[PDB]
Design an enzyme around this catalytic site. Structure first.
Site, PDB file in Angstrom:
ATOM      1  NE  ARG A   1     -37.018  -5.587 -74.944  1.00 19.00           N
ATOM      2  CZ  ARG A   1     -37.616  -5.458 -76.126  1.00 19.00           C
ATOM      3  NH1 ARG A   1     -37.556  -4.313 -76.779  1.00 19.00           N
ATOM      4  NH2 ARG A   1     -38.278  -6.477 -76.657  1.00 19.00           N
TER       5      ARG A   1
ATOM      6  NE  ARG B   1     -48.152  -5.098 -87.222  1.00 16.33           N
ATOM      7  CZ  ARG B   1     -47.077  -4.992 -86.449  1.00 16.33           C
ATOM      8  NH1 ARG B   1     -46.650  -3.792 -86.097  1.00 16.33           N
ATOM      9  NH2 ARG B   1     -46.428  -6.078 -86.037  1.00 16.33           N
TER      10      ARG B   1
ATOM     11  CE  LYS C   1     -35.429  -1.110 -80.247  1.00 11.63           C
ATOM     12  NZ  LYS C   1     -36.674  -1.890 -80.490  1.00 11.63           N
TER      13      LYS C   1
ATOM     14  CB  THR D   1     -32.171  -8.074 -82.940  1.00 10.72           C
ATOM     15  OG1 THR D   1     -32.651  -6.770 -82.605  1.00 10.72           O
ATOM     16  CG2 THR D   1     -33.203  -8.759 -83.771  1.00 10.72           C
TER      17      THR D   1
END
Ligand code: PRO
Ligand code: PRO
Ligand code: PRO
Ligand code: PRO
EC number: 2.7.1.40
Lengths: 505, 406, 406, 502
Positions: free
Chosen positions: D50, D97, D241, D299
């Site tokens: 990855r 953000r 994802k 994760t």
């Protein structure tokens, strides 16, 4: 267990172990009706008494019935031998016949030409030129090319020309002809005497002598079962109707005939007249199975132990026929001429027992249940859930039987639908239903005479005791065994039954 | 779904659709020794002619054998509507009768494909048969007859060392009662069904036909149950041997055993056989199982199986496909020999071996494909399974491939 | 219909139906010794309070025990919305220490319902524990704690002679690697699930909650799998003994253990349990079977057992219904002990025995039926199972009855 | 036998006797890109590399990809340790953000959100700035807003045009440039960011095997990534994802547009509650096995191993249950990516995923498929079943499938056979794009095509046969299943062979 492993398992040097769960039906006539003989047949297997009504006077038959019951209560005191015996009235039913040949016989040839008349002037005059038959609407049914069978199939004909009250025909298969012999017209929607004028007199006589079921002859449509249903009337509304299927049209409309009937008879031989040898066994297997599905009872008759009419043992070919009829799932198989007029009516019941017992070893046993347990849908009918709970419990502890306290017999029917392995002992105070119960595979009825009580609990507690002792005596189970009990409904009440697992005292 | 749901659906008004899968054996005799007659008896469904040695000098038999063969090849002018006919020597028997040894040698040297050995009771009793057939009969398949009580008593060991089994019900119902014999039959058939070896039901088949053009529905029912008990063949006796309607007899037997087919529950016979079979490691077997499973997965019109010794087609047959196994072979013994197997429809290749091994294969597969078409089993566009070797000389049939009919 | 089709169907947007069927044990300490607090813990889901007997002396335990009972009974107002609360003595061990025997005596003589006996190894140990409790506390339940390799090594005999099993994964984490411990837990829980005896798994539950008002999603997951593995109870340690949010810690444990339920596939768990279990000679088992089997046949809103001993309700639990098992009892030790079993919701009858049996039974049965409605288990019109006895003081519960909620 | 019996058989003193069949995906950065380290990881189990594109210059990544293929073909000197390592590009994807704290500041208090760009570098415990220009456009009064690893949930008392005033709930030390989440609102596109397109372009160029498209929330979103990869990248596998609520909400359409799925557990854990996540996991894995499509679990996996040589038991079991649920690949992150134990993690990760195989109800799994699955007219399906049956009929050591595409060695896997599928291929891509599949072990054929189809097959079969012996999948005197390929004209039909091992 797989089915095939089970077949490989079989052991002809090992003695039968299961109860015979198929009810034996016997036709009573000349050789059978002496109370002493009748007593021996009850004792040696018999479960039902057939009365063949194409014969006899009412006085003849009513005496036959009287003898049956004399022999029945001959065992009144003894639990080891006391069994309900039932009485079944088999109508003569609509039928066609030829005339009297010179009134004695003629002779028929291959390919020859035959004429047929309705003209009654030609009744007692009968031969190779012309034949007469009591059916008056034969021309509105049969068309050109139609095959017509005659005297137990043994002679077939076709139809070259047909007009008003005559028909010119051509013999397809030959053989010696005779007087007043049966005629069939295959695939033909035979126009209707639904029930004969004689049949109503025998049906009424039936109601009069408290018979249990009528085997209604020659049934073709739903309406036909509906006729016998109505003639029987409010007076006879618990008389079970078993429709015989004896011809192609029956097999054809068999779906509605089973909806209307209380039960079904497979007349193998009579089937064999209108449909080919290669096709009948399909039709048998089909009807039987469709009945097992419907939950209604199915009787397998004709051509069983007929060898035994003159010999004291059956042909191995016959050993087979019955067994592979137990196995397709017949509840009952009916003896005919071998009990009614043979020289061995006794061995016939005996053998028929021996045989139907051996065949239990080859019934695919445990699996039969396991299937319908799953696939069966979810209900809301508590009575259903309770029966499954019972048959389940039955299997959880190899119980020796499942004692069901029933009035109707319904609740012990339900239970049998889930086909448990251990026998159902249906305990009843209604001496009728006790009899109307041999019609059902693996139900062994038992008649309670001890009378009703105020407090439900102690009443239930009583008949359970009764069953327990009968059961011990027959050898269904020892002491220190477990058994499943359905009580009945309590008579307040919510209509709810009660499943109990009780050890045998 | 369910066995019971099957039965419920049965219809005697809709013509059978599957082909007869049970092999008709006939006993040949005075009523039927005629070449001219046998041309009608195999055209009508005979797949084995049986010789009853109980009544004969060799010249009696040898002529009959020749008469059978003579009428066989009277069709060779069409290599697809053509079909094998095996020949059966049924020993007179009573251990190994010394009359028989004189007769076995006759068979061995007359190119009989199988020996129905009689009154067999032990392993020794069939071993003794074996050696007599010798190295000139190492092939020739021996089918034990179970007749006494001891046969049923020592059956496993008999099966252990025989190619076939014949239940002779008549000669059973004489040593053991009627309430028990049908039990005996059902167990035997079922036990041959497992072990893979073929089983045939004999005696009291269509006897009534010895004097009548049609049979009794009681007989229709006895014969069909042997079919559904899991028999591979049903054998006729007097009906065609000394009868009066021998041809008529065969055609009925066919008719019956074809109707019978509508009542076999394949979808479970397979399932149970598959579940019982061991984990064995013949490349050639493992293909069969795969071959069958795939035939069911895509509802294949047939399973074509190119084979030498037959043993390949045998394996596929062990697991009871719904679809017909067309065995393609040149070895015409194991081709005639094929007929003692349910649902195998063997076919003889008369084309000269091809130059390329791919070219050879493609020819034979296209043959079966053409047999299968005209014969009725499938039509252009259908899907069939096909078993072949990977290369030649591979002691294995272990290729499997699903291919459309052209 | 398939394990997989279940999984595909799941829904995080569909609010849960089933009640939590897994018992919540909590550990009482400083953060939760309070009565004012305990009144909010049992209200929020505590079913067994556990006293941690490593660090403490008897006076401090006795006050806590009394604190519990004081808050327990503080809901006796309605006999219906009230729940039993068992009490757990967790011994400290490292076979059976002098300090243990001293502490066990304190328990035996304090009406404690169960003892979680630590560091159990061989069969001898639980036996050595038994003796200690003697006839005085023959009724108290022995939960063997499994904490090292010897436990998992000799587990069968341990289980064979304990009342229950605790899996201490943490203390089990020291002794053997990570990649193996889940393997060991899955096996123990599954072995208890067979044997019928209840299993609790503890440690590493919601530790993060000692400082935070909400747990890590890996804790959400670790607990829910313990549920789905077939645990009866999951037990909280530090989360509620010290944690700044002990009460907040329970509601979550409930919340998780309730969501978990939606991923249990009963429709097979039952079928497998049933297939494995042998035939009985005991009526009281067979009834359970039938009852659970009937509870599936008609989708019963609940199964109501009326029991004295407990054993009746335990049986039904063993075969794992979808339906909640309401155990109706007088004996309020079994009422409390009842929490150790999956899907049993025990209720305490404070009504005085009626004159007639009929009378008595009908009252207790209308009890559950009312408690039932009161919770959420059923509405008027629903169907339920009801398991009573026949004659009173009969050895058994063996009456199966399918009745409508009034 | 029965599931529960199986659970009881489990023996922790009995050593694993099954192939790991879950391909391992490692995240590569700082701690892991030294060729010499990458070598030890390939040896220790890696299957996919990855690349985390939230960082690094293109030339940073460009080098990292090179070091991989350096260490890959380091083993190609033989065929025994040689495995086809694959390369996966993980877009950084859309993000929202908050600015720099006027390096930070800090319950129940009332806070103001601004779109006002002047306030960009001017953040503090009273005013807060965020990119997402339409933030007010997808919100009502009382919508939750999570901030900085879910650490700070917030509602919204009122909003108008360029401002949101709201209440703190969860609190604790704020920071700067920290992510924000809007569960669960139809968040504003672009699906693909500007940076995303540049990185997808570099992806196609550097010939990666698969892209892990971040933050996928609808079918449209998938198709954007696909059209961007364009005709040039038409064989790069897209693994959407799923990181938020809405993804789960529309997961059905997301699954058929994608080639595969990644369950981002932790990112899921911030928008949907801890008590519901594991349902969402099982749900997604579940629907994927039903779809054929591959499913990757990412994760939280081994984060303890970032600073310790071994994982915690809670972590061991989380992975094991991820295997058991039905995940094809389980992905490592920061523990391979930037830790003090990267090698040691790929080790532990493998160990775990193997132990776990013993608790997969192996032989059963297939049996359901055989019955339930319908009738086809599709010869290719029957051959597959025929092969898997045959596999089981003689306990094959493996089922060798000769595939170009990998299509055919996919079918065989759809039927969950218990023996390893050794996928033999010449196309060195569909060969790396092959670790995404449970119990498929690819093997790269170097030897070149031949005109005589028969002998071309015979060659690769031999190839596989030898590889297989050496890997340890089977001795000689064992049987194995083979699917050949399609022929060459031809009838597009495959061929199933039962062949013994020479
Ligand atoms: O005995 C007798 C009863 C009637 C049918 C079978 N069982
Ligand atoms: O005919 C021919 C093949 C042989 C067995 C069944 N049918
Ligand atoms: O609550 C209470 C019961 C105990 C087990 C789960 N539910
Ligand atoms: O080798 C290794 C294989 C490839 C993907 C799954 N596990």
């Amino acid at each position: 267990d797989t089915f095939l492993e089970h077949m490989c398992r079989l052991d002809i040097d090992s003695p039968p172990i299961t109860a015979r769960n198929t009810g034996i039906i016997c036709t009573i006539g000349p050789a059978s009706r002496s109370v002493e003989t009748l007593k021996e047949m009850i004792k040696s297997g018999m479960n039902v008494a057939r009365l063949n009504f194409s014969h006899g006077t009412h006085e003849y038959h009513a005496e036959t019935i009287k003898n049956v019951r004399t022999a029945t209560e001959s065992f009144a005191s003894d639990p080891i031998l006391e069994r309900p015996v039932a009485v079944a009235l088999d109508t003569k039913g609509p039928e066609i016949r030829t005339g009297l040949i010179k009134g004695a016989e003629v002779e028929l040839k291959k390919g020859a030409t035959l004429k047929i008349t309705l003209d009654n002037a030609y009744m007692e005059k009968c031969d190779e030129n012309i034949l007469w038959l009591d059916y008056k609407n034969i021309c509105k049914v049969v068309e050109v090319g139609s095959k017509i069978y005659v005297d137990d199939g043994l002679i077939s004909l076709q139809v070259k020309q047909k007009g008003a009250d005559f028909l010119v025909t051509e013999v397809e298969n030959g053989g010696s002809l005779g007087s007043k012999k049966g005629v069939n017209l295959p695939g033909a929607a035979v126009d209707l005497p639904a029930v004969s004028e004689k049949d109503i007199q025998d049906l009424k006589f039936g109601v009069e002598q408290d018979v249990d079921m009528v085997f209604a002859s020659f049934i073709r449509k739903a309406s036909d079962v509906h006729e016998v249903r109505k003639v029987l009337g409010e007076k006879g509304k618990n008389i079970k109707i078993i429709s015989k299927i004896e011809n192609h049209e029956g097999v054809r409309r068999f779906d509605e005939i089973l909806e209307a009937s209380d039960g079904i008879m497979v007349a193998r031989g009579d089937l064999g007249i209108e449909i080919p040898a290669e096709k009948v066994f399909l039709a048998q297997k089909m009807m039987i199975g469709r009945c097992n599905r419907a939950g209604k009872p199915v009787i397998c008759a004709t051509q069983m132990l007929e060898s035994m009419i003159k010999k004291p043992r059956p042909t191995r070919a016959e050993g087979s026929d019955v067994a592979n009829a137990v196995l397709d799932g017949a509840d009952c198989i009916m003896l005919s001429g071998e009990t009614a007029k043979g020289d061995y009516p006794l061995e016939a019941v005996r053998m028929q027992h021996l045989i139907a017992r051996e065949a239990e070893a080859a019934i695919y046993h445990l699996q039969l249940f396991e299937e319908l347990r799953r696939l069966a849908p979810i209900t809301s009918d508590p009575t259903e859930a309770t029966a499954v709970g019972a048959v389940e419990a039955s299997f959880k502890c190899c119980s020796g039987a499942i004692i069901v306290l029933t009035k109707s017999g319904r609740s012990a029917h339900q239970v049998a639908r889930y086909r448990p392995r251990a026998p159902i002992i249906a305990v009843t105070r209604n001496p009728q239903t006790a009899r109307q119960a041999h019609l059902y595979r693996g139900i062994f009825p038992v008649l309670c005479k001890d009378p009703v009580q105020e407090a439900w609990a102690e009443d239930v507690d009583l008949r359970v005791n009764f069953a327990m002792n009968v059961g011990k005596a027959r050898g269904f189970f020892k002491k220190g065994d477990v058994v499943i009990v359905l009580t009945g409904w309590r008579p307040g009440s919510g209509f709810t039954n009660t499943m109990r697992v009780v050890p045998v005292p």
